[PDB]
Amino acid sequence: GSSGSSGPPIILQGPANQTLAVDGTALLKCKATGDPLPVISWLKEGFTFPGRDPRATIQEQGTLQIKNLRISDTGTYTCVATSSSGETSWSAVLDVTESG
Q: Where would I find the Ig-like C2-type domain in this sequence?
């Protein structure tokens, strides 16, 4: 990207539409740059997530990892990256199937 810009937080690479199989591991990649850096956040259908979930978690690289997926988990993920500068968010849906 461009190292030395002025504006809102940009998501070099966000989540994409992936079709995983229930009872698996979902990995939602999300990389955003900013000065300071934006605050990565995942919203499930417009709700805090994972927030309070043991199975679900996020890595230092804003990587949302969820184990023991479920056909119900299928929803709309939004990686929000708010930064002192501005604000931004991505769009992606994780389609969970029984037989892929």
A: 9-95
| Domains of the chain, first to last | 1-100 (2.60.40.10)
Cβ–Cβ < 8 Å for 9, 1: no
CA distance 41 to 81: 6
Strands of 1-100, DSSP E: 10-13, 18-21, 25-28, 31-33, 39-44, 48-49, 57-58, 64-67, 76-82, 92-97
Q: Give the amino acid at 93.
A: V
